[PDB]
């Protein structure tokens, strides 16, 4: 949601354009065994620990 | 001198600024490439195919 | 008790969250000298650096 406030407000919007579901990315899912496919090949990440 | 001063910048990293010199028009085109790719990255959903930027650009392709 | 363990799902929401700033930034360079109607939250938020 983009808003524009009135230049010299009390704040108030000239026009909100409401830009349908803009694509940003493609994150990777989880198999049910809970392996990632990066390219490919199957693949875990380790837990951390600090 | 904003306009000399800026020509002689740009006209410079072309010119010297790259391991394999290339001519002003190979850069120029190159920068045009990348523009597209921005608007068609998510205009796209994916981003454009190999042959996409090539229609929009007049050329070869 | 001091040893905490993180594991994927942490690690990809502050991976996501970098690409979130690094859009920031662009984001807020665009409302910089933007036009009014013309633009949308599509023109300015990228897919590469998220």
Do not use: C
């Not at chain 3, 662009?26 to 599509?42: C, H, I, N, W």
């Amino acid at each position: 949601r983009l808003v524009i406030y009135e230049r010299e407000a009390p704040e108030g919007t000239v026009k909100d354009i409401k830009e349908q579901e803009v694509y940003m990315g493609e994150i990777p899912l989880m198999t049910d065994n809970g392996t990632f496919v990066i390219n490919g090949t199957e693949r875990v990440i380790v837990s951390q620990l600090h | 001198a904003t306009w000399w001063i800026r020509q002689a910048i740009t006209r410079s990293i072309a010119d010297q600024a790259r391991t394999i010199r290339i001519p002003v028009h190979m850069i120029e085109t190159i920068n045009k490439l990348n523009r597209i790719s921005r608007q068609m990255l998510q205009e796209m959903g994916r981003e454009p195919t190999p042959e996409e930027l090539a229609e929009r650009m007049l050329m070869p392709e | 008790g001091n040893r905490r363990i993180r594991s994927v799902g942490e690690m990809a929401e502050n991976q996501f969250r970098v690409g979130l700033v690094r859009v920031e930034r662009a984001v807020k360079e665009r409302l910089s000298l933007g036009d009014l109607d013309t633009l949308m939250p599509q023109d300015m938020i990228n897919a590469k650096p998220i």
